[PDB]
Design a protein around this ligand. Structure first.
Ligand SMILES: C=C1NC(=O)[C@H](C)N(O)C(=O)[C@H]([C@@H](O)C(N)=O)N(C)C(=O)[C@H](C)OC(=O)[C@@H]2C[C@H](C)CN2C1=O
Ligand SMILES: Nc1nc2c(ncn2[C@@H]2O[C@H](COP(=O)(O)OP(=O)(O)OP(=O)(O)O)[C@@H](O)[C@H]2O)c(=O)[nH]1
Ligand SMILES: Nc1nc2c(ncn2[C@@H]2O[C@H](COP(=O)(O)OP(=O)(O)O)[C@@H](O)[C@H]2O)c(=O)[nH]1
Ligand SMILES: [Mg+2]
Lengths: 155, 425, 428
């Protein structure tokens, strides 16, 4: 099955093997057992060119795994700024909510990815969105004493 | 009729340094043991060469304090085998001093004590100096006292103990150590004289005009009190002639064995021409709470015994008159079941130590009172103990050093009963 | 008497090297091992940290450990790099790749026995070994994974000796990777069980001090390490010079650790200075500042919690009366922040010898329940990563199971709940 091979190639960052697999009918929207797609894995592990290739060939930019994670959630969590920008350019939902109630803004705020926080805000990230404990990204920055983040969130 | 002095831990050793400094001067003995010119034989052996040697043992679980004795002014005074040190101290942990670390050296200490005791023709007992707050002073003293009771069942044992003061302290757990050692030593001690470090500190500040007293300042003042208490043992004594008489005169019941010491006059050496104070004046000062060795209010308590030990130019009739006047005072109440003041006079004036902070005086007095008011000092310790023990704060340090957790509550219950003993009398 | 110092990984060797530079200058030991000092106080306790070799030479009782060789080369390049015992450099070649699993189970395990031999040799040479001091980061792979492996092995071989750590906690503000919360949480689990005393050196705090208080636009590791070395000098002063209070590792622990798991200290000091900076503070200023949240080396606000215990050390010629007055004043005016069920829980020492470049300094060591804020911040980052299973293959591929992650996180959250319990407790 070419789906599994494309998932592994996208995770592993093998640009050449990704192209060959898609040229042979690989399901660009294949899922592993948890619902992750090749775009999810390339977004997680920083493979910008594979992200770009997949989005040009039918990948669902807003696909969710079984926990509600989108590719943008994972890029915002891991801190891949260019991938965040490319996903947003291709219509990623900036306020997608996962099963924990987290939005991309929450995850970038928790992990201190301040440049990504600013990008997400400029693209309409919801500063009032609450996780399942009632916390907004601003609450996280106040509770953890991250003054730099709090200032970005207030501008 | 020999007495053996045992100095345990830093406080015990440093107080011992000052006590033997003073004893030597009182008896004309030089730091090398020689004497230019006997009653002092109770406290000093004599070699075949005219060298007089303290009947004294110094013990500590680390070496730094006793190493100063071994190399300082008195490096030739003591038996070098009676200066005994381990390598690693009790870390302010009673359980280390008593159970783990202390047990590595207890047999050696007892064998060296036996060497001294075998030199005695009529050993009376032991004087044991130590802090409450340190791990050696608390835990190793307790172990030593337990062992001495077994090995010397008929011998008396007196303590000089340092009661802790937060403002001059080196451990948060000093209340634990104080209660643990009091619990295990109570059965084994015949009489214990406590000195509150805050009380002596404030006497040094107020009466000696010393802004920042040192341990040396405190210890030289303590040594004057100790010397008054033991003068009867070292000179021709009519009162408190032997150790047995301290219990007779001061301790009506074995558990209530903590007399309050008060000493007067304490005058700065910078006032060399002070007006000399009368017998009445120094005796009256023994009933002012600010001259006491332990912070408490004897006007809130009852006296069970009172001994007045005078030194110097003191005429007996003047003592009897001074006592007559204070007997009239309403603030001095005795229990119904006791006679009464006991009086001793030593006609030599107190000795002045070169380097000391005290002015020479022509007369002085040390009052030893067994007053129920000292229970106030037990209550202060018990309260700090209770606050920490309710949360088991620091208890794991003791349980990890050979002690069962139940010893804490057993010790505290013994203290509750001790406080009750004071209330009942 | 003797302390055996170990420094593991890149962070651990960099701050360790700086420690030995700073205290060597304080004790008058030059880069060759010769004493060129001015005062008898410098040598009185020199054996705590230094072996005395042939011909009045002084050699740090220091063991240098790393899975990457490049660090050992840079240590040797430093001012005091050649003062260390060459046989006490123990270094692999593979590296750990910022992977706790590699440090703790794979390449680190293969190097650890070689480290324990050198530890054994230093220890058998001691008159009376006090215990061990380890410098490391928690966010990498060698200092974190192999450092904690080293701790558990030393603990097994030396169960009666004190284990103290200077542990550098990761922050996104100074980060190489998002797996740092994994590595830190796995390590904290180990430190909770196997150390007696841990100084929480928080890169978040170090960055905040440099950026905001010292106005350094882009802090370097040298900038951060200037704060670490001043802290390490200050908190070891009572161990290195003669004194009455906290004069060895076990007396410090007995005064600072009322419950065995709650042994994570918040350090602080005053004045805070940048490298090259230049009026000596008063005792009131020293006292106010070393208790200020802005002067803490852990990114926690003490006023959000309660002090279980505190040690402070003033350094320099100054009025002992003023020290006691100011120390009493901070407690009486802020009495609610000191737990009432540990009476007299703040102790103060004074050392006449000031650190380099200052006439007056003060160092704070707090055991405060507010340190839960540090563990909560790491926990939240750990949980955000672990919920999405990001990068877990790097750990399970070295043999670990996911359950080690869950147990590490559960133990750290239990630590947090314990702090909050004593924060809320009352005397009644
Ligand atoms: C050196 C002194 N003080 C200090 O070194 C510190 C700064 N200090 O002022 C304290 O209060 C603390 C402690 O008591 C506390 N923090 O509560 N501390 C450790 C002492 O006091 C120690 C035990 O005292 C001495 O060693 C001598 C004994 C003499 C009778 C008076 N001394 C001092 O004043
Ligand atoms: N009066 C007086 N008190 C002292 C002296 N030295 C220490 N202390 C007091 O003794 C208590 C601390 O115990 P230490 O005697 O120093 O401890 P230790 O017996 O050596 O036991 P560890 O060191 O724990 O093994 C505190 O209350 C100190 O204030 C001294 O020379 N004179
Ligand atoms: N303060 C400080 N932190 C450092 C230093 N070097 C690395 N770190 C931090 O340590 C973590 C990386 O661990 P590192 O020591 O480099 O990995 P190791 O060599 O595998 O132990 C991150 O939190 C870095 O910020 C340093 O010199 N000083
Ligand atoms: Mg001691």
């Amino acid at each position: 099955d070419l789906g599994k091979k494309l998932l592994e190639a996208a995770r592993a960052g093998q640009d050449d093997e990704v192209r060959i697999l898609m040229a042979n009918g690989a399901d660009v929207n294949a899922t592993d057992a948890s619902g992750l797609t090749p775009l999810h894995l390339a977004a997680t592990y920083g493979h910008l060119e594979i992200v770009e290739v997949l989005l040009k060939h039918g990948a669902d930019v807003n696909a969710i795994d079984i926990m509600g994670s989108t590719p943008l959630h994972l890029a915002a969590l891991i801190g891949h700024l260019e991938i965040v920008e490319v996903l947003l350019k291709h219509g990623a939902d900036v306020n997608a909510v996962d099963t924990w109630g987290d939005t991309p803004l929450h995850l970038a705020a928790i992990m201190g990815h301040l440049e990504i926080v600013e990008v997400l805000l400029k693209h309409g990230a919801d500063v009032n969105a609450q996780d399942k404990f009632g916390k907004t990204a601003f609450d996280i920055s106040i509770d953890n004493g991250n003054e730099d983040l709090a200032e970005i969130l207030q501008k | 009729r020999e007495c053996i002095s045992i100095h345990v831990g830093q406080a015990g050793v440093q107080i011992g340094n000052a006590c033997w400094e003073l004893y030597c001067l009182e008896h004309g003995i030089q730091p090398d043991g020689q004497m230019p010119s006997d009653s002092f034989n109770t406290f000093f052996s004599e070699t075949g060469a005219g060298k007089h040697v303290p009947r004294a043992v110094f013990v500590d679980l680390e070496p730094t304090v006793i190493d100063e004795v071994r190399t300082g002014t008195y490096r030739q005074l003591f038996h070098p085998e009676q200066l005994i040190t381990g390598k690693e101290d009790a870390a302010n942990n009673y359980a280390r001093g008593h159970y783990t670390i202390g047990k590595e050296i207890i047999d050696l200490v007892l064998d060296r004590i036996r060497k001294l005791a075998d030199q005695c023709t009529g050993l009376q007992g032991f004087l044991v100096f130590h802090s409450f707050g340190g791990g050696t002073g608390s835990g190793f003293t307790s172990l030593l006292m337990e062992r001495l009771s077994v090995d010397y069942g008929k011998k008396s044992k007196l303590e000089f103990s340092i009661y802790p003061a937060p403002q001059v302290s080196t451990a948060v757990v000093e209340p634990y150590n104080s209660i643990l050692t009091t619990h295990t030593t109570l059965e084994h001690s015949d009489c214990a004289f406590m000195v509150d470090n805050e009380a002596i500190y404030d006497i040094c500040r107020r009466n000696l005009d010393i802004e920042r007293p040192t341990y040396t300042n405190l210890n030289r003042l303590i040594s004057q009190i100790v010397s008054s208490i033991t003068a009867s043992l070292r000179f021709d004594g009519a009162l408190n002639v032997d150790l047995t008489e301290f219990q007779t005169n001061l301790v009506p019941y074995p558990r209530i064995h903590f007399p309050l010491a008060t000493y007067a006059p304490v005058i700065s050496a910078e006032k060399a021409y002070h007006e000399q104070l009368s017998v009445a004046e120094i005796t009256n000062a023994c009933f002012e709470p600010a001259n006491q060795m332990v912070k408490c209010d004897p006007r809130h308590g009852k006296y069970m015994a009172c001994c007045l030990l005078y030194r110097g130019d003191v005429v007996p009739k003047d003592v009897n008159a001074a006592i007559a006047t204070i007997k009239t005072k309403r603030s001095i109440q005795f229990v119904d079941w006791c006679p009464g003041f006991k009086v001793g006079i030593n006609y030599q004036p107190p000795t002045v130590v070169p380097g000391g902070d005290l002015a020479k005086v022509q007369r002085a007095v040390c009052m030893l009172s067994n007053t129920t008011a000292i229970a106030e000092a037990w209550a202060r310790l018990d309260h700090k103990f209770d606050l920490m023990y309710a949360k088991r704060a620091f208890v794991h340090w003791y349980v990890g050093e050979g002690m069962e957790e139940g010893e804490f509550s057993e010790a505290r219950e013994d203290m509750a009963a001790l406080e009750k003993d004071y209330e009942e009398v | 008497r003797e302390i055996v110092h170990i420094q593991a990984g890149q962070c651990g060797n960099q701050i360790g090297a700086k420690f030995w530079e700073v205290i060597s200058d304080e004790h008058g030991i030059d880069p060759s091992g010769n004493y060129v000092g001015d005062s008898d106080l410098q040598l009185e306790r020199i054996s705590v940290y230094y072996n005395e070799a042939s011909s009045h030479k002084y050699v740090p009782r220091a063991i240098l450990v790393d899975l990457e060789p490049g660090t050992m080369d840079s240590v040797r390049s430093g001012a005091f790099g050649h003062l260390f015992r060459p046989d006490n450099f123990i270094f692999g070649q593979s590296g750990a790749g910022n992977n706790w699993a590699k440090g703790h189970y794979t390449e680190g395990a293969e190097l650890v026995d070689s480290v324990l031999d050198v530890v054994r040799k230093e220890c058998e040479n001691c008159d009376c070994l006090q215990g061990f001091q380890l410098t490391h980061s928690l966010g990498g792979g060698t200092g974190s994974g192999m450092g904690t492996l080293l701790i558990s092995k030393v603990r097994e071989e030396y169960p009666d000796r004190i284990m103290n750590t200077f542990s550098v906690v990761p922050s996104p503000k100074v980060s190489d990777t998002v797996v740092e919360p994994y590595n830190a949480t796995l390590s904290i689990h180990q430190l909770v069980e196997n150390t007696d005393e841990t100084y929480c050196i928080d890169n978040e705090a170090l960055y905040d001090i440099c950026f905001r208080t010292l106005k350094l636009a882009t802090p370097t590791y040298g900038d951060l390490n200037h704060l670490v070395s001043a802290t390490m000098s200050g908190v070891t002063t009572s161990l290195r010079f003669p004194g009455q209070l906290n004069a060895d590792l076990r007396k410090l622990a007995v005064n600072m650790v009322p419950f065995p798991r709650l042994h994570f200290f918040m350090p602080g000091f005053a004045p805070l200075t940048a490298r090259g900076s230049q009026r000596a503070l008063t005792v009131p200023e020293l006292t106010q500042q070393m208790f200020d949240a802005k002067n803490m080396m852990a990114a926690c606000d003490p006023r959000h919690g309660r002090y279980l215990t505190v040690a402070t050390v003033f350094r320099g010629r100054m009025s002992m009366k003023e020290v006691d007055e100011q120390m009493l004043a901070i407690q009486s005016k802020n009495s609610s922040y000191f737990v009432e069920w540990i009476p007299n829980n703040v102790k103060v020492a004074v050392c006449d010898i000031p650190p380099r470049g200052l006439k007056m300094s003060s160092t704070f060591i707090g055991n405060s329940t507010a340190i839960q804020e540090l563990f909560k911040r790491i926990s939240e980052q750990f949980t955000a990563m672990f919920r999405r299973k990001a990068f877990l293959h790097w750990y399970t591929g070295e043999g670990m199971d996911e359950m080690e992650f869950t147990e590490a996180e559960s133990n750290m959250n239990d630590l947090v709940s314990e702090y909050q319990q004593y924060q809320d407790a009352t005397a009644e």
